[PDB]
Structure formats: C-alpha cells, structure tokens
C-alpha cells in the first residue's frame, strides 16, 4: 500500500526462492502483461541467478512508454529501459486507490532534466530548472521552475488519465548457480510396476520397491558395484526405495 512515485521508483531484489509465476499470468487482474524475449509459461520452466523488481505509478497513457525502444516524459526523465531488455512488464489499473477527489498530489513525477536517463539510471534531484535565459541556479521565479510535477489523479477523468501501477522485472546472467526457479511437479509414487521416473534429476526406468537399506541422512541415492543406480530416496516422505530393471 506504499507504491513508489515514479520519479523515485523503488527496486526489489529477489533471490533464493521458488518463483511461482503461474498465478501471475493466470490472474486476470493484470490489465497488461509483456515479456521481451521471454514467454510467460517458460518463466516457471526457467531459472535465474538473481532477479529485480521495480514499481512506480503512472497513468494509462504513460503505461505505453514502459518498453524498450520507447521514449517520453516517464521513459526518459523518470525510468528508462535498455533496448536489449530481457525482462517482462506487468501493469494494472489502480484508479480508485490512487485517484483523489482533488487530485493525488502525494505522488510526483519529473518534468525536467538536463539530459535523458541512461538505462536504469535513477535521479531524484530537485534543482530548480532553467527554463529560459536566466541562470536560475536554484532560485524560483520567472522561467525558473520546480523540476518535479505532482500527479493530478482526479476521479473525474477518462481511462487514459486514470492512474496505473506498474511492475517491471528482469533476471541476471548465468555467472553463478541459479537461485530462483518455478515450482516442480510432485506426482504420486508407484510400486511393483515398470515405470519411467525422474526423482530429482536421476532419470531411469525400472520397477520400484521399498527395501531394508539404511541410507545416511545426507545420502540421496544408492549405487551398485558396477556403478549402476541401485536405490533412491523419495524426497517427499524420505523413505528408501529400491530399483530393479524392468523384465
């Protein structure tokens, strides 16, 4: 309930967790969903070293600016993305919450900057801008204007004017082992039948059975003298199974 004003967009770091994206693209509440070089269902399939999440408030017409190869007041002055941005964008409408009867001036957005932001560059400076011949140098007056602008989120406007909430996420390169992944399947076990199995990564075919072998707490699967898999530990109930090749 504390969404960031776009001029000072906040950033969230997510790592070492199960990233369940199934609800996100299944939920219809998100008016807009976009992935650049990525697919929604594939996100659960994929794993990343580390991922970030940015959030800011903008009205409907400004939501169109959040994308690679796009420009505008928001895109250039407040929050800029690169053209090779390998991430996704999620936005939804927040008119009732964000809009105030006299306009929601609690939220601010940048109107002026001496140069456009570089990708992911952040700036909250408030120096009075020189809008004319006068070297204002931080003094208000004629042609000396406050660089930030307060949001006029009045309820009595159309969809284009009404505020929106935006979330932008991206993932890092594979410089190290991944730490965030989609949820994995956990199917029911079978015994005394020939089945295909994939326990963690161990993949094989054979008939299964619980046996008397006593694994140590840390050991996951057994091995034979000839280096063929000979037993497995069930990762749900941690019971020790035994594997025999299909006849």
């Amino acid at each position, epitope marked *: 309930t504390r969404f960031a004003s776009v001029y000072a967009w906040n950033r969230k770091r997510i790592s070492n967790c199960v990233a369940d994206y199934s609800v996100l693209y299944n939920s219809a509440s998100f008016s807009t969903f976009k992935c650049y070089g990525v697919s929604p269902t594939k996100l659960n399939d994929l794993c990343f070293t580390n991922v970030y999440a940015d959030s800011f408030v903008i009205r409907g017409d400004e939501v169109r600016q959040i994308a690679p190869g796009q420009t505008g007041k928001i895109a250039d002055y407040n929050y800029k993305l690169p053209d090779d941005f390998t991430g996704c964008v999620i936005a939804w409408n927040s008119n*009732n919450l964000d*809009s105030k*009867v*006299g306009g*929601n001036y609690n939220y601010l957005y940048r109107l002026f900057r001496k140069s456009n932001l570089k990708p992911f560059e952040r700036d909250i400076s408030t120096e009075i801008y020189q809008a004319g011949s006068t070297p204002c140098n931080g003094v208000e007056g004629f042609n000396c204007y406050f660089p930030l602008q307060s949001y006029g989120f009045q*309820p*009595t406007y159309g969809v284009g004017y009404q505020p929106y909430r935006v979330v932008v996420l991206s993932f890092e390169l594979l410089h190290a082992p991944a730490t965030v992944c989609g949820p994995k399947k956990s199917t029911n076990l079978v015994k005394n039948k020939c089945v295909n199995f994939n326990f963690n990564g161990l993949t094989g075919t054979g008939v299964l059975t619980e046996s008397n072998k006593k694994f140590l707490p840390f050991q996951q699967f057994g091995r034979d003298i000839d280096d063929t898999t000979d037993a497995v530990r069930d990762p749900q109930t941690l019971e020790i199974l035994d594997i025999t090749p299909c006849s």
Partner: antibody
Amino acid sequence: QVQLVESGGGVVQPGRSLRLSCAASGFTFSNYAMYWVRQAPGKGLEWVAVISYDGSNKYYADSVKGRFTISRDNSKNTLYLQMNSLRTEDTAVYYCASGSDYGDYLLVYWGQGTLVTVSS
Amino acid sequence: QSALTQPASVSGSPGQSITISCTGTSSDVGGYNYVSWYQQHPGKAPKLMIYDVSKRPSGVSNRFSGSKSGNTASLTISGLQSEDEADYYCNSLTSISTWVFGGGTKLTVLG
C-alpha cells in the same frame, strides 16, 4: 472497524452561526477525503460539500455553498463544518463520511450522526 | 437537492430477485462508472454496500449485483429476505466534482 462520531449538534436562532464536527478513529484520517451528509425525518439523504485529503481543495453544492464552510484537522483525525445563514428547514440530522481503500470518492464509513435545531 | 431519479417502490416474495434503477443527466451518471448504493434501517444511519456500480465491499452479502446502461445504473438484489426491507438510495459523482444522492426507492420483501 473504522468509526466516525459526529458532535456539535446545537440549538440556535436562524442566521446565527453554528458549528458541526466529527472525529475519526481506527484509520489514517489524513489519507482520505471527508464528506458531510444530512437527513430530515422521514426523508432521504442529502449531500454536503467535500474537503480533500490535505484540505487544499474543496467543492460545494449551491444549497450549502457560501452558507457553510468545511475544514479538517489531520493531527486530531477530526472534521469540522462552520455554518451560517441557517433556516428552519435546516433542522436535520447530519452525518459525515470518508473515502477508504475502496475509493477516495466513496462515502464508505458513516457515524451515528447528530441533530441540529433551528427556530425563532 | 438535485437528486437522482429512482423508481418509487417494488415488492416481491422471499427468495425472489428485484432490480432498482438509478438515473440522472449524462454528467451525473453517464460520465463515469462510480455509481454507488446505500441502505438504511430503522433508527440507524445509512450504510453503503456498492462501489463502481458492481463491486461488493467487505461485510456485504453476495446477493448484490449492479450494471450500467446509458444514463442509468441499476442494483439487483437476489435472494430477497426480510432484512432487505428498507429505503434504498443511489449516489453518483458529477463532472462538477460534486456528489448527488438519489430520491430513494422502497423495497418490500413479503415475509
């Protein structure tokens, strides 16, 4: 639950000044706009002017415009209504309401109200 | 006040479904989808259980539904019960940035 209590109902001659107030509790009063509503016996609901979350802007209906003024205190979580040019018809029960997470333009929470009496 | 127009009265047996309409000028109703509805009970202040024409706040029955059409918006009360017997009012926001209440509508559930 969010609660609103109206106070300041009084007996006054017509035209003479009068004050209505109501205090809020249980939520961020400063975050949301505030409203006033008045009802006559055996009749419907009538709307009264509005004040913004920070009090910087106001909007009035002609029946109360000029006659009544609305102000707020965000530290005491309280609302005020300053009244003048009253009439006998102005005798009614007044409620105040506020917006919430549902919407700043909603009259979500209501108090029990208070009574105003005007006669010569 | 310049109240919105509503039908005078309606009646139905328990378990039936009835709808109440709320109408006004284009600026009052048609301009935006912020219509809301209120319910009052004897010796109590009014209560609001509608927003954005159709949405249901918390602490509200599942029997309330609403829709908008042209310069008119309507509230439908399914599963009529004795508790529903009351006078109902609608509110909408005008382009003047002022809120307007309806004239009222009285519903009877034949318990």
